[PDB]
Amino acid sequence: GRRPARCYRYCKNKPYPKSRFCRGVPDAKIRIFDLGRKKAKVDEFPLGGHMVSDEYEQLSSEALEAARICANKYMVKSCGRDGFHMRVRLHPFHVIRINKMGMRGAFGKPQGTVARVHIGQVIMSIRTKLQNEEHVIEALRRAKFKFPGRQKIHISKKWGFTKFNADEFEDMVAKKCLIPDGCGVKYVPSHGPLDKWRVLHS
Amino acid sequence: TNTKGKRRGTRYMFSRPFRKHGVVPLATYMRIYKKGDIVDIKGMGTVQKGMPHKCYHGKTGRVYNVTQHAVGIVVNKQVKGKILAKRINVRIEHIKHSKSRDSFLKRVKENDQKKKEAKEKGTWVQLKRQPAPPREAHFVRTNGKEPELLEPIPYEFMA
Amino acid sequence: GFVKVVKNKAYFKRYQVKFRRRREGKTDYYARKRLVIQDKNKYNTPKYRMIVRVTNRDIICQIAYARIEGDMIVCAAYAHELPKYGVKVGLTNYAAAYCTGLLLARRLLNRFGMDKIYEGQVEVTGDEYNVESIDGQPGAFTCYLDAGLARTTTGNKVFGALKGAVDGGLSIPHSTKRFPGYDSESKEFNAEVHRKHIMGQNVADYMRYLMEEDEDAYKKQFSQYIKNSVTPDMMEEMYKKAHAAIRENPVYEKKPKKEVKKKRWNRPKMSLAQKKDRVAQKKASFLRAQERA
Amino acid sequence: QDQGEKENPMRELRIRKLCLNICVGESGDRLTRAAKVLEQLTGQTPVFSKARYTVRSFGIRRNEKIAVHCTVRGAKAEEILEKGLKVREYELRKNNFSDTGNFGFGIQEHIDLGIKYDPSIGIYGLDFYVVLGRPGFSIADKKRRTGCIGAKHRISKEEAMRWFQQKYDGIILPGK
RNA sequence: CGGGGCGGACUGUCCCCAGUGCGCCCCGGGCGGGUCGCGCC
RNA sequence: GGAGCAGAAGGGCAAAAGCUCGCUUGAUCUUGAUUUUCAGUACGAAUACAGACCGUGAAAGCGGGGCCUCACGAUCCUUC
RNA sequence: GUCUACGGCCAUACCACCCUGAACGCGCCCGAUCUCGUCUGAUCUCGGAAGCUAAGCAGGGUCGGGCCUGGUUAGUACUUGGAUGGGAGACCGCCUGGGAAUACCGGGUGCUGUAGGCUU
Numbered sequence A: 001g002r003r004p005a006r007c008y009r010y011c012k013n014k015p016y017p018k019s020r021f022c023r024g025v026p027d028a029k030i031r032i033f034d035l036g037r038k039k040a041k042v043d044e045f046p047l048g049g050h051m052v053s054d055e056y057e058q059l060s061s062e063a064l065e066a067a068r069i070c071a072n073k074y075m076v077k078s079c080g081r082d083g084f085h086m087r088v089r090l091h092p093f094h095v096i097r098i099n100k101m102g103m104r105g106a107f108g109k110p111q112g113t114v115a116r117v118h119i120g121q122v123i124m125s126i127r128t129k130l131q132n133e134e135h136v137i138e139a140l141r142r143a144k145f146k147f148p149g150r151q152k153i154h155i156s157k158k159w160g161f162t163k164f165n166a167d168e169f170e171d172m173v174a175k176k177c178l179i180p181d182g183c184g185v186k187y188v189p190s191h192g193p194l195d196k197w198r199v200l201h202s
Numbered sequence B: 001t002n003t004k005g006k007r008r009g010t011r012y013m014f015s016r017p018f019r020k021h022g023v024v025p026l027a028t029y030m031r032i033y034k035k036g037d038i039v040d041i042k043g044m045g046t047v048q049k050g051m052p053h054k055c056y057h058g059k060t061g062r063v064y065n066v067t068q069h070a071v072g073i074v075v076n077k078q079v080k081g082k083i084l085a086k087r088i089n090v091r092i093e094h095i096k097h098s099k100s101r102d103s104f105l106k107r108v109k110e111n112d113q114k115k116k117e118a119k120e121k122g123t124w125v126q127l128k129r130q131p132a133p134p135r136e137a138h139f140v141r142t143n144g145k146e147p148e149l150l151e152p153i154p155y156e157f158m159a
Numbered sequence C: 001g002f003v004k005v006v007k008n009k010a011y012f013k014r015y016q017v018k019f020r021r022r023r024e025g026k027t028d029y030y031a032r033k034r035l036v037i038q039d040k041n042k043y044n045t046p047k048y049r050m051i052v053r054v055t056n057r058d059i060i061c062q063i064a065y066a067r068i069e070g071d072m073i074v075c076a077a078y079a080h081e082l083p084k085y086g087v088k089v090g091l092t093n094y095a096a097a098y099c100t101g102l103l104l105a106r107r108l109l110n111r112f113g114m115d116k117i118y119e120g121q122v123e124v125t126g127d128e129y130n131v132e133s134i135d136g137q138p139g140a141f142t143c144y145l146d147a148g149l150a151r152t153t154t155g156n157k158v159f160g161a162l163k164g165a166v167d168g169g170l171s172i173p174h175s176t177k178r179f180p181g182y183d184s185e186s187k188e189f190n191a192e193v194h195r196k197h198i199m200g201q202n203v204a205d206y207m208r209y210l211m212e213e214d215e216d217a218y219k220k221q222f223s224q225y226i227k228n229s230v231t232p233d234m235m236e237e238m239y240k241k242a243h244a245a246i247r248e249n250p251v252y253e254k255k256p257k258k259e260v261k262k263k264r265w266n267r268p269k270m271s272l273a274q275k276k277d278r279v280a281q282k283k284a285s286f287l288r289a290q291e292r293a
Numbered sequence D: 001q002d003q004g005e006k007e008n009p010m011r012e013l014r015i016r017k018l019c020l021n022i023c024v025g026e027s028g029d030r031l032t033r034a035a036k037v038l039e040q041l042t043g044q045t046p047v048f049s050k051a052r053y054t055v056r057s058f059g060i061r062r063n064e065k066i067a068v069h070c071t072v073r074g075a076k077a078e079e080i081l082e083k084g085l086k087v088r089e090y091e092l093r094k095n096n097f098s099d100t101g102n103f104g105f106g107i108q109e110h111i112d113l114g115i116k117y118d119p120s121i122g123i124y125g126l127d128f129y130v131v132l133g134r135p136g137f138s139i140a141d142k143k144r145r146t147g148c149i150g151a152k153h154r155i156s157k158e159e160a161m162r163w164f165q166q167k168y169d170g171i172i173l174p175g176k
Numbered sequence E: 001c002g003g004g005g006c007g008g009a010c011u012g013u014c015c016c017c018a019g020u021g022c023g024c025c026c027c028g029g030g031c032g033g034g035u036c037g038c039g040c041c
Numbered sequence F: 001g002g003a004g005c006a007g008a009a010g011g012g013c014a015a016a017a018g019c020u021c022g023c024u025u026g027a028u029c030u031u032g033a034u035u036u037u038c039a040g041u042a043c044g045a046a047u048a049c050a051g052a053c054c055g056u057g058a059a060a061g062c063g064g065g066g067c068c069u070c071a072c073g074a075u076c077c078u079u080c
Numbered sequence G: 001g002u003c004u005a006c007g008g009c010c011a012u013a014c015c016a017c018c019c020u021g022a023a024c025g026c027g028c029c030c031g032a033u034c035u036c037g038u039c040u041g042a043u044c045u046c047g048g049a050a051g052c053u054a055a056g057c058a059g060g061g062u063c064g065g066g067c068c069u070g071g072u073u074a075g076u077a078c079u080u081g082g083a084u085g086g087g088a089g090a091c092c093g094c095c096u097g098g099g100a101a102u103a104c105c106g107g108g109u110g111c112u113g114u115a116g117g118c119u120u
């Protein structure tokens, strides 16, 4: 059926996405990239924990779906159903080829898609409250068991799935430089229209 | 493998720069070119007449012939193991002058005026140029304050 | 809040503006490229074009050649400088274009010193004339015609100015097809109605027709003819005296007026500290207003 | 008084084009008679308008002749517009006014006003589109030094309705 | 970090309002570069 | 310009090179030079000129085929 | 201090909205006898001068959007040359030189040629 992943572990073939030129590609196994309670606002889930690669290699969509499933199951039976939100941060855009079951006319045909990950690159992220940190770490370790390379579990210095740090977060919210909307936040720079400042700051 | 078409591989070099399309500016047409001067060959792609080959794009030659809209240029091209002077007819939207030779001519005139003033005033002055000498021993004032102590930072993993 | 906006951030990010005089609507760079640029094996010969522009109240005739820093006007005539002899009213019409072109030609070649030869046609008949270069004497001035965005049809005042310059003595290549005497259906040039258009006899006929038909609409149309009392008679002779005065003394001279003050008629551009203080006190006044509540 | 009597020289809604149109899905003598009613109604020779693409549903193919239209401006335009509003009894109801300050309507039968019926000529309806302007709108279609007309010189729906009911004492916004 | 007399424009504290830049010269304070500089080490 | 420019794709193009009219046959007759593949041979294709005769336009100009990159063929023999 | 005509560079010049405009000018504007064009003197062409800055245009404004230019990002990413360096590999560190680009934060917002006007 599917070859062992060690045949396609390494990035050596010059990114190959599905386009005009690459037609007839099957669907990747990972279809859901976000999971859990995706509507908690910004401050329901302040703690973010990433699982980040430390190797230059490509991971298969099958491995991504397996890790997403097992991390989701541990988070569900540990932190409750609506106690977390996870996003995988890696989409399988690179198409891998297979040659048919001599070497004449040997250019293969699309059999799958993988995601190429770099050395410093987040593979998965979970945001949760500040008291489930060990549960996030355990879920990410048990999901780390589904990949070929070497991965590290790291708690971010930033508030949830944002790009602003947890110490300067509430101060920016209070001085209204950072307005919450949805899962994330908008940054308000002090160079727009003053009428925008007036419909804000009031 | 590949074709021997005349514009093979010229997807980007014969294109226009970003937000630079449309009408060709008229100063490029109203430059003058006397036979003997040094011109750069670039070859824009808005004009399709008289355009140079991709081997001559980005090159530099001298004018040997002037016609109504074009110029005959003598360019050095490197065929496999020899350099030979090719004679190409290229249009004035595709060429422009050479500031290198311009700079050389103005330092020639500066040298001539300097030698004239030295001869009339009775001195000896330097005319050549010298390649960036070493660095002439000097004192560095601390202005009373002590130099700041630098120190490598600890390792923290952000990204 | 339903339709996708078109002039958005990416629209202005990759918008490329046209040339300044194109997006002001004054220069056709197609015709400009074909008309200004000299052959490269001439190397420095200026290429002269006679710009003719008819505004709402004035006719401008210039003679220029292009340099890299911008064009160079050599001579310029004006319908507003026409009334210092002969005519006083009835500018920006075909007869005014003829005398303007004549004045520009005579001014240019008496600047160049070739007035004692190249007399053109000292009497006006609206027929085909082209100057020729007398051997041993300097060659005739060669100019082309810059009509700009003016739609060239039969009976355009740009061709009035062309006929004026050619009778003045310039050599401008042309044909009599776009002259008001030209008949389209017979491909024939009459030249007597062209002479009438040069003398302004069509406006005189309009004046006579309006007088015998009416009084109040006639003076409402030609109000500034009643002032200076330009009857439909003495219109052609008047233009003949205008032509004679141009041939007599075509040199331009201006007047000095230098006793002027330095008053600002615009507003100065505001400064950075002014703008910062403006937005500061605007915020302060807003917060003060919302605490008055 | 003093602040109101300044713009009255050059800021007055006047009637630009009347935009008369008849569109019928067939060609031939029906279009010739549809042009003949236009000639006898306006005094101008009208202009034919072609299909742009075959649709085959009700059935027209491209490059045919489908419509006859005419453009009328001035005193003739205002008096023909007067006749059309006499037919509409100076009532056009809510939303015929476009957001650019133009409007129009349709007439189902032309003989009512004006010209007497001719037995050869048919029974054709038509539609009126008045596009309305202001002195200085010709800079948008001037050839030399073209410009756009400027923001507060435009015609809005509100001032179009205000001008209509002030110049024809008509009625907008009926019982619905 | 600034003080005196003349010129515009801003603010929802506008008669009793406030604050900003620019033009004239008078000074006030501190910093640097050239000066037979001038001495002293 | 997200349209179109005969077709593959790329480039180019807006009072254009697109669309609609008007007039035409520079898709004609000639010698040489050059570029492209290149051995710096040929063909093919192309680019600057020059000499005629013309077309168009008020004119400057533009035009010796197709906006550019492809669309084609020695000796010998036959035919005009 | 500005404007017309023709421009050069071609957004610091564009776009959106708001305010001001003395004098010349540029326009809007009035008309269709002639020239010439239209279904339509709306456009184009012609003949004017009663009114007008409403509009175009110009200048200014906006914690404006774009654009231009700096800082930061960052000596980061990438990279020339070197090693009997490390590591099972994947890749990584060092030596010798070069060295970016977003996000984010400032400042700016048309210069100028020739000819001819107005501004006491």
Ligand SMILES: [Mg+2]
Binding pocket: A012, A013
């Ligand atoms: Mg490979």
Ligand SMILES: [Mg+2]
Binding pocket: B001, B002
């Ligand atoms: Mg190949």
Ligand SMILES: [Mg+2]
Binding pocket: B001, B002, B003
């Ligand atoms: Mg190939």
Ligand SMILES: [Mg+2]
Binding pocket: none
């Ligand atoms: Mg060609």
Ligand SMILES: [Mg+2]
Binding pocket: C028, C031
């Ligand atoms: Mg033209």
Ligand SMILES: [Mg+2]
Binding pocket: none
């Ligand atoms: Mg010719």
Ligand SMILES: [Mg+2]
Binding pocket: none
């Ligand atoms: Mg020839």
Ligand SMILES: [Mg+2]
Binding pocket: none
């Ligand atoms: Mg901005």
Ligand SMILES: [Mg+2]
Binding pocket: none
């Ligand atoms: Mg280094």
